[PDB]
A paper describes a structure:
In mammals, meiotic telomere attachments are achieved by a meiosis-specific complex of MAJIN, TERB1 and TERB2 (herein referred to as the meiotic telomere complex) that repurposes and integrates the functions of two complexes, LINC and shelterin, which otherwise perform distinct critical roles outwith meiosis. MAJIN provides the inner nuclear membrane attachment through a transmembrane helix at its C-terminus, whilst TERB1 is proposed to interact with SUN1 and cohesin components through its N-terminal armadillo repeat domain and C-terminal MYB domain, respectively. MAJIN and TERB1 are physically linked by TERB2, which binds MAJIN through its C-terminus and TERB1 through its N-terminus. Here, we report the crystal structure of the MAJIN–TERB2 complex, revealing a 2:2 heterotetramer in which two TERB2 chains wrap around a core MAJIN globular dimer.
Using this as a model for molecular replacement, we proceeded to solve the structure of a truncated complex (MAJIN 1–106 and TERB2 168–207) in an alternative crystal form at 1.85 Å resolution. Both structures are essentially the same and the subsequent discussion is based on the latter higher resolution crystal form. The MAJIN–TERB2 structure demonstrates a 2:2 heterotetrameric assembly, in which two TERB2 chains wrap around the surface of a core globular MAJIN dimer. Size exclusion chromatography small-angle X-ray scattering (SEC-SAXS) revealed scattering curves and ab initio envelopes that closely match the heterotetrameric crystal structure for the truncated construct, with the wider complex demonstrating an elongation consistent with its additional sequence being largely unstructured in solution. The MAJIN protomers adopt a β-grasp fold, in which a β-sheet grasps around a core α-helix in a β(2)-α-β(3) configuration. The five-stranded grasping β-sheet contains an insertion between β4 and β7 strands, which forms a two-stranded β-sheet appendage that splays from the base of the structure. TERB2 chains follow a meandering path from their N-termini at the MAJIN dimer interface, passing around the α-helix to complete its closure and providing an additional short β-strand to the grasping β-sheet, and terminate by forming a third β-strand of the MAJIN β-sheet appendage. This interaction is mediated largely through the insertion of hydrophobic side-chains of TERB2 into pockets on the MAJIN molecular surface, in addition to a salt bridge between MAJIN residue R14 and TERB2 residue D191, and the aforementioned β-sheet interactions. At its N-terminal end, TERB2 residue Y176 contributes to the MAJIN dimer interface that contains a hydrophobic core formed of highly conserved MAJIN residues P64, F73 and Y75. Whilst the 2:2 assembly is stable across a range of concentrations and chemical conditions, with smaller oligomers never observed in vitro, its disruption through MAJIN mutation F73E Y75E yielded a stable 1:1 complex with secondary structure composition matching that of a single MAJIN–TERB2 protomer.
Residue numbers in the entry:
A (entry chain C): 0 to 106
B (entry chain D): 175 to 205
C (entry chain A): 2 to 106
D (entry chain B): 175 to 204
The structure:
């Protein structure tokens, strides 16, 4: 169903995600239309947002916009600056930060 | 006019919130 | 001096910049399609400006706002290009290997 | 809120429509 804590729609947030030996930095942003209005069935929306994050992780080298039932998502990567100055650990295991930050512009 | 999410490849593997101070996760600086 | 863009209808444009030829696609979203603009010279100039920004940031595409639009630029692989040859007179032009799509909203 | 186009780097050089059969442009297959 959902392995991640619910996203705080419609509030923008930064999330760090651990998958295998890597850690990823994600930012979620909401546009004017979807931001002003709020919807009560947030479970469907939270599922759609996790689904959107998983699509982005599934297309790391070919980001493209896509439509969910309630949103259009425009994913973008940008260089994660000073990621060399950060160290991420899971117990004693060093996690490798993916060198790009993912921003999902949810519209 | 955008492609449906259902036509996209999706990473379906294990995915966890990285939350320092929990589940053995820690983060800090260097230099 | 570029030919007018065919707003609000999608189009494919081939553009020569430096030693390369670029393939651009313009797409318009639901909102901007329902409402139409009468003075298209301003719009054509904004779209040229948008193309020039993409060409100025080939390695770091990001969305941006013009006076009338939000532009979401994306690149995808230009498929079936390897068997094509472009010339400007005797000059060989190199196709840039990615299509640029401007999602105009 | 999206960044203004006016804050971004812009290619200011010569930019032409590539139209085969005009201005010396040609395209063809193998």
């Amino acid at each position: 169903s959902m392995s991640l804590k619910p996203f705080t729609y419609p509030f923008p947030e930064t999330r760090f995600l651990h998958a295998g030996p890597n850690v990823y930095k994600f930012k979620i942003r909401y546009g004017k239309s979807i931001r002003g209005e709020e919807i009560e069935n947030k479970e469907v929306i939270t599922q759609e947002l996790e689904d959107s994050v998983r699509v982005v992780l599934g297309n790391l080298d070919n980001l493209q916009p896509f439509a969910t039932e309630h949103f259009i998502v425009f994913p973008y990567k940008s260089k994660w600056e000073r990621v060399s100055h950060l160290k991420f650990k899971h117990g004693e295991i060093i996690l490798i930060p993916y060198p790009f930050v993912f921003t999902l512009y949810v519209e | 006019g955008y492609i449906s999410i259902d036509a996209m490849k999706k990473f379906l593997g294990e995915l966890h919130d990285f939350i320092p101070g929990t589940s053995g996760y820690l983060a800090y600086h260097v230099q």
